[PDB]
Design goal:
This is part of a larger assembly, with two copies of chain A (about 50 residues). Chain A is mainly alpha-helical and about 50 residues long. The chains hardly touch.
Chain lengths: ~50, ~50
């Protein structure tokens, strides 16, 4: 039983690492989406002038 | 949005400033204006005999 539990915990740790990785990738993509929206807002603030 | 300063511009010309021809010397024939339907406010009649 102890061996089974240990092996399961090792797999759990590895899976959690993989999840952290996918979260990191998503966060990077969202960071660029944020930068793009910031630039568009800047352009709009410029374009508001008459 | 909406945080603006307004600049007013006025139509500056001879007509707006007035006198439409300062004609100081005189002896100059001037053109007449149009029919000007709006200004003539005489008695109204829906006769139309024709």
């Amino acid at each position: 039983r102890f061996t089974s539990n240990i092996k399961g915990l090792t797999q759990a740790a590895r899976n959690a690492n993989d999840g952290i990785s996918v979260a990191q990738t998503t966060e990077g993509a969202l960071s660029e989406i944020n930068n793009n929206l910031q630039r568009i807002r800047e352009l709009t603030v410029q374009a508001s002038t008459g | 949005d909406g945080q603006t300063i307004t600049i007013d511009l006025k139509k500056i010309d001879s007509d707006t400033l007035g006198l439409n021809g300062f004609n100081v010397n005189g002896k100059g024939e001037t053109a007449n204006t149009a029919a000007t339907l709006k200004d003539m406010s005489g008695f109204t009649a829906a006769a139309a005999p024709g």
